Design a protein around this ligand. Structure first.
Ligand SMILES: O=C(O)CCC(=O)C(=O)O
Ligand SMILES: [Fe+2]
Length: 325
């Protein structure tokens, strides 16, 4: 299991519910005002909660993730949308609770090329099966990855709030610290070498869309940073080793992930913060019904520094333009 857990008491959950009334702007149509109101209102959250979130945000020895339990109950939840294009989560009370927690940690951001720049994306099963694929997506394991491995503007954190869970849908987490503990000195040194080229994810592609950084990037290393607190960039579908040993080292990371990954089945009222520099994530197979009661998460992204993406956004805008990813 996860172990890095923050459990809100009923009094803390009640304070959070009250503080959410200070966030009144439309999350989709006035994203910057919505996020700025959440950042200001987050000062009213219980100090014990704020302390834990700031410690996690600092990063040093943070475990790669933070699971938050005991959020106020999801009460009049609409049916789970059958597609992930509606942005239903963005108008629920859970999205306000998620914004308050997010804005303690850092600045919320969105990407034009990822779910049409929605402040909160609906993470719901897709019935879609493209040419290469032999299954709709939930029918296969979502492989270990860091979010936007190809992009220097990738989020620092991935935020997932659970509206409806599925008991067979396990979220898998595996930290860069867990990886390094299983490797030899030589494997660690090689993972720190720029031996992997990156490719823009197919979902980021569009007619007439050109990326300033091109379609193929790198070579880049898989590991970087401090020896005792390494950062990881990984994605087997979008990363190709420049040589046979670099390709074999990707397999070594995958085997270590299967051996050491921790799992958690997200349930209503829970929120998971993933440190996108310190951990990789994945998801098991599950069997959605597309009946209105399927697994439904609200996903959002966090960056420590909004100035790093200013060149890619408009003034008082929260959306990174596609060509800059
Ligand atoms: O469905 C999950 O548990 C995680 C999905 C995922 O890859 C994400 O949140 O980026
Ligand atoms: Fe992901």
């Amino acid at each position: 299991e996860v172990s890095a857990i923050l459990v809100l008491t009923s009094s803390e959950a009640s304070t959070l519910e009250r503080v959410a009334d200070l966030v009144t702007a439309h999350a989709l149509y006035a994203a910057h005002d919505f996020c700025a109101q959440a950042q200001l209102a987050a000062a009213e959250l219980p100090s014990r909660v704020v302390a834990r979130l700031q410690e996690f945000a600092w990063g040093d020895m943070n475990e790669g993730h933070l699971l938050i339990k005991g959020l106020p109950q999801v009460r009049s939840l609409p049916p789970t949308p059958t597609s992930n294009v509606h942005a239903v989560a963005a108008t629920t009370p859970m999205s306000r609770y998620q914004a308050l927690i997010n804005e303690c940690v850092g600045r919320m951001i969105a990407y034009e090329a990822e779910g049409h720049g929605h402040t909160f994306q609906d993470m719901v099963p897709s019935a879609m099966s493209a040419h290469s694929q032999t299954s709709l997506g939930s029918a296969v394991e979502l492989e270990l990855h860091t979010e936007q491995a190809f992009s220097p503007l990738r989020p620092d954190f991935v935020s997932l709030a659970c509206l409806r869970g599925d008991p067979r849908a396990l979220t898998y987490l595996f930290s860069a610290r867990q990886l390094v503990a299983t490797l030899t000195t030589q494997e660690i040194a090689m993972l720190r070498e720029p031996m992997w080229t990156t490719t823009v994810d197919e979902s980021f592609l569009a007619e007439g869309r050109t990326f300033l950084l091109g379609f193929e990037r790198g070579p880049i290393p898989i590991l970087s940073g401090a020896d005792d607190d390494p950062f990881i960039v990984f994605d087997q579908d979008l990363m190709r080793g420049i040589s046979a040993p670099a390709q074999e080292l990707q397999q070594t990371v995958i085997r270590a992930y299967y051996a050491e990954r921790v799992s958690h089945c997200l349930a209503p009222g829970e929120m998971l913060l993933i440190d996108n520099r310190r951990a990789v994530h994945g998801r098991s197979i599950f069997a959605p019904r597309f009946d209105g009661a399927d697994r439904f998460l609200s996903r959002s992204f966090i960056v420590a520094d909004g100035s790093r993406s200013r060149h890619a956004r408009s003034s008082f805008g929260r959306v990174v333009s596609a060509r800059f990813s």
